[PDB]
Design a protein around this motif. Sequence first.
Motif, PDB file in Angstrom:
ATOM      1  N   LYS A 193      16.794  82.013  36.591  1.00 35.20           N
ATOM      2  CA  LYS A 193      16.113  80.707  36.719  1.00 35.20           C
ATOM      3  C   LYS A 193      17.164  79.595  37.018  1.00 35.20           C
ATOM      4  O   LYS A 193      18.295  79.696  36.580  1.00 35.20           O
ATOM      5  CB  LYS A 193      15.239  80.393  35.471  1.00 35.20           C
ATOM      6  CG  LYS A 193      16.001  80.075  34.178  1.00 35.20           C
ATOM      7  CD  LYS A 193      15.139  80.192  32.938  1.00 35.20           C
ATOM      8  CE  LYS A 193      15.573  81.445  32.152  1.00 35.20           C
ATOM      9  NZ  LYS A 193      15.076  81.512  30.748  1.00 35.20           N
ATOM     10  N   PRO A 194      16.779  78.530  37.776  1.00 30.76           N
ATOM     11  CA  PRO A 194      17.715  77.463  38.023  1.00 30.76           C
ATOM     12  C   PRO A 194      18.070  76.629  36.808  1.00 30.76           C
ATOM     13  O   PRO A 194      17.299  76.555  35.899  1.00 30.76           O
ATOM     14  CB  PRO A 194      16.993  76.622  39.101  1.00 30.76           C
ATOM     15  CG  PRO A 194      15.535  76.850  38.890  1.00 30.76           C
ATOM     16  CD  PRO A 194      15.451  78.278  38.423  1.00 30.76           C
ATOM     17  N   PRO A 195      19.260  75.993  36.800  1.00 25.40           N
ATOM     18  CA  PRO A 195      19.789  75.442  35.562  1.00 25.40           C
ATOM     19  C   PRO A 195      19.131  74.167  35.007  1.00 25.40           C
ATOM     20  O   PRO A 195      19.358  73.836  33.818  1.00 25.40           O
ATOM     21  CB  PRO A 195      21.266  75.187  35.906  1.00 25.40           C
ATOM     22  CG  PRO A 195      21.311  75.053  37.375  1.00 25.40           C
ATOM     23  CD  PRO A 195      20.246  75.913  37.913  1.00 25.40           C
ATOM     24  N   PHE A 196      18.351  73.485  35.854  1.00 25.21           N
ATOM     25  CA  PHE A 196      17.682  72.227  35.489  1.00 25.21           C
ATOM     26  C   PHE A 196      16.171  72.400  35.564  1.00 25.21           C
ATOM     27  O   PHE A 196      15.448  71.461  35.397  1.00 25.21           O
ATOM     28  CB  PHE A 196      18.177  71.081  36.333  1.00 25.21           C
ATOM     29  CG  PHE A 196      19.678  71.016  36.466  1.00 25.21           C
ATOM     30  CD1 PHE A 196      20.462  70.559  35.434  1.00 25.21           C
ATOM     31  CD2 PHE A 196      20.303  71.321  37.664  1.00 25.21           C
ATOM     32  CE1 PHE A 196      21.853  70.417  35.577  1.00 25.21           C
ATOM     33  CE2 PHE A 196      21.688  71.222  37.810  1.00 25.21           C
ATOM     34  CZ  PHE A 196      22.472  70.783  36.747  1.00 25.21           C
ATOM     35  N   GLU A 197      15.696  73.642  35.626  1.00 31.40           N
ATOM     36  CA  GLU A 197      14.248  73.916  35.519  1.00 31.40           C
ATOM     37  C   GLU A 197      13.611  73.297  34.260  1.00 31.40           C
ATOM     38  O   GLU A 197      14.315  72.971  33.255  1.00 31.40           O
ATOM     39  CB  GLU A 197      13.988  75.394  35.527  1.00 31.40           C
ATOM     40  CG  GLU A 197      12.793  75.838  36.339  1.00 31.40           C
ATOM     41  CD  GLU A 197      12.483  77.303  36.131  1.00 31.40           C
ATOM     42  OE1 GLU A 197      12.482  77.728  34.945  1.00 31.40           O
ATOM     43  OE2 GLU A 197      12.240  78.006  37.147  1.00 31.40           O
ATOM     44  N   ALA A 198      12.282  73.129  34.361  1.00 30.57           N
ATOM     45  CA  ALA A 198      11.470  72.326  33.453  1.00 30.57           C
ATOM     46  C   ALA A 198      10.024  72.454  33.839  1.00 30.57           C
ATOM     47  O   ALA A 198       9.704  72.939  34.934  1.00 30.57           O
ATOM     48  CB  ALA A 198      11.866  70.889  33.502  1.00 30.57           C
ATOM     49  N   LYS A 206      15.618  64.057  34.952  1.00 28.32           N
ATOM     50  CA  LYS A 206      16.508  63.735  33.779  1.00 28.32           C
ATOM     51  C   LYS A 206      17.698  64.739  33.702  1.00 28.32           C
ATOM     52  O   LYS A 206      18.857  64.325  33.792  1.00 28.32           O
ATOM     53  CB  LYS A 206      15.700  63.789  32.440  1.00 28.32           C
ATOM     54  CG  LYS A 206      14.900  62.550  32.011  1.00 28.32           C
ATOM     55  CD  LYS A 206      14.192  62.859  30.663  1.00 28.32           C
ATOM     56  CE  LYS A 206      14.395  61.840  29.534  1.00 28.32           C
ATOM     57  NZ  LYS A 206      13.696  60.561  29.822  1.00 28.32           N
ATOM     58  N   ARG A 207      17.349  66.035  33.614  1.00 26.31           N
ATOM     59  CA  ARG A 207      18.274  67.175  33.580  1.00 26.31           C
ATOM     60  C   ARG A 207      19.366  67.137  34.649  1.00 26.31           C
ATOM     61  O   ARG A 207      20.566  67.292  34.298  1.00 26.31           O
ATOM     62  CB  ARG A 207      17.502  68.486  33.643  1.00 26.31           C
ATOM     63  CG  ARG A 207      16.562  68.743  32.464  1.00 26.31           C
ATOM     64  CD  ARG A 207      17.288  69.332  31.246  1.00 26.31           C
ATOM     65  NE  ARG A 207      17.920  70.627  31.562  1.00 26.31           N
ATOM     66  CZ  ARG A 207      17.433  71.801  31.190  1.00 26.31           C
ATOM     67  NH1 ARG A 207      16.339  71.826  30.480  1.00 26.31           N
ATOM     68  NH2 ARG A 207      18.034  72.937  31.525  1.00 26.31           N
ATOM     69  N   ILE A 208      18.974  66.835  35.900  1.00 23.83           N
ATOM     70  CA  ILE A 208      19.905  66.789  37.072  1.00 23.83           C
ATOM     71  C   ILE A 208      20.759  65.548  36.993  1.00 23.83           C
ATOM     72  O   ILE A 208      21.982  65.638  37.181  1.00 23.83           O
ATOM     73  CB  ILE A 208      19.158  66.858  38.512  1.00 23.83           C
ATOM     74  CG1 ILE A 208      18.450  68.194  38.739  1.00 23.83           C
ATOM     75  CG2 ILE A 208      20.088  66.574  39.636  1.00 23.83           C
ATOM     76  CD1 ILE A 208      17.252  68.178  39.682  1.00 23.83           C
ATOM     77  N   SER A 209      20.132  64.373  36.814  1.00 20.15           N
ATOM     78  CA  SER A 209      20.880  63.085  36.812  1.00 20.15           C
ATOM     79  C   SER A 209      21.937  63.083  35.722  1.00 20.15           C
ATOM     80  O   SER A 209      23.065  62.584  35.929  1.00 20.15           O
ATOM     81  CB  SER A 209      19.937  61.920  36.648  1.00 20.15           C
ATOM     82  OG  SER A 209      18.995  62.250  35.656  1.00 20.15           O
ATOM     83  N   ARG A 210      21.595  63.723  34.592  1.00 18.54           N
ATOM     84  CA  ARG A 210      22.523  63.905  33.448  1.00 18.54           C
ATOM     85  C   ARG A 210      23.367  65.217  33.453  1.00 18.54           C
ATOM     86  O   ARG A 210      24.217  65.400  32.596  1.00 18.54           O
ATOM     87  CB  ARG A 210      21.715  63.818  32.159  1.00 18.54           C
ATOM     88  CG  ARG A 210      21.140  62.429  31.946  1.00 18.54           C
ATOM     89  CD  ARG A 210      19.971  62.449  30.993  1.00 18.54           C
ATOM     90  NE  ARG A 210      19.528  61.087  30.676  1.00 18.54           N
ATOM     91  CZ  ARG A 210      18.700  60.797  29.672  1.00 18.54           C
ATOM     92  NH1 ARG A 210      18.177  61.767  28.884  1.00 18.54           N
ATOM     93  NH2 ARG A 210      18.326  59.542  29.500  1.00 18.54           N
ATOM     94  N   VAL A 211      23.151  66.109  34.434  1.00 15.10           N
ATOM     95  CA  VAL A 211      23.866  67.412  34.576  1.00 15.10           C
ATOM     96  C   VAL A 211      23.800  68.267  33.252  1.00 15.10           C
ATOM     97  O   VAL A 211      24.798  68.720  32.747  1.00 15.10           O
ATOM     98  CB  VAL A 211      25.321  67.238  35.090  1.00 15.10           C
ATOM     99  CG1 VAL A 211      25.821  68.539  35.716  1.00 15.10           C
ATOM    100  CG2 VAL A 211      25.476  66.114  36.108  1.00 15.10           C
TER     101      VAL A 211
END
Length: 257
Positions: A193-198, A206-211
């Motif tokens: 699964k991709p690392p910023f999935e939700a 949120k996940r991406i902008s904050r890494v």
Amino acid sequence: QWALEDFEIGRPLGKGKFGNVYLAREKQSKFILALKVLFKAQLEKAGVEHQLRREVEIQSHLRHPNILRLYGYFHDATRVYLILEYAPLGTVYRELQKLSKFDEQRTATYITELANALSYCHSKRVIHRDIKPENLLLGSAGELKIADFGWSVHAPCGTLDYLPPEMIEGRMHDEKVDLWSLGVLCYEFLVGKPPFEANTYQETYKRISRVEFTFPDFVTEGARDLISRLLKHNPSQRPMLREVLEHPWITANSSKP
Ligand SMILES: Nc1nc(Nc2ccc(S(N)(=O)=O)cc2)nn1C(=O)c1c(F)cccc1F
Ligand SMILES: O=C(O)c1cc(-c2cccc(Br)c2)nc2ccccc12
């Protein structure tokens, strides 16, 4: 130059996304290929006519063994037809659904083939901006091929999973966008699964902008190092494609001709 009467149409290979892809054969040569049939109706409503012409323009000039060939196009009063190379082993998306996750060997190989195609791409100033397993195909030797140059352009939306911060924020972006995508892919190939999935777009943003990613226990340090270096907020802090091809995790696990 090209008409529908020139081909024998066969089984569906995928569905739109506006239009379908069908297996086809050219009558005169018996050349097997894939025909993407887009509808002018849907294309008008989305306003993508300029983007598609742009895609076809870019994709028809490129020549690389890890980039899917476009041989030509045509259209009718109601549809536009794209003449693509047929990748016999299907999508990386479907491969990953079958195995759940890939081993280091298969992942490092896929990342090498991917970086190579991107070096070639960037060396003609083209940035893909859209690498994701559903847009990656597998040839007869199981070699990876990049497929959808729809959202590509000269440097310097559905699910956000593969987009870097600078893009989701609307900031100016260049070649370093594809380096992020590589890190997201490298993660998804190993983890499944991709690392910023939700469950929502808003959370993924949120996940991406904050890494905000964490590694499961099976991810090895060499993989953790390459992924971490690729998933930087600051594009200039991402490595070059050269550096990625020469990473010790890559060199120790990939393949060559
Ligand atoms: N050009 C191309 N070749 C193939 N080969 C293919 C695709 C699917 C299968 S299968 N039976 O579903 O596992 C087998 C072979 N797909 N393809 C495409 O443009 C394509 C794509 F990019 C995305 C989605 C669907 C497509 F069809
Ligand atoms: O009716 C046309 O002339 C038309 C043509 C095309 C077209 C023609 C050739 C190549 C490509 Br790509 C697209 N796209 C459309 C997309 C939307 C609406 C109309 C069109």
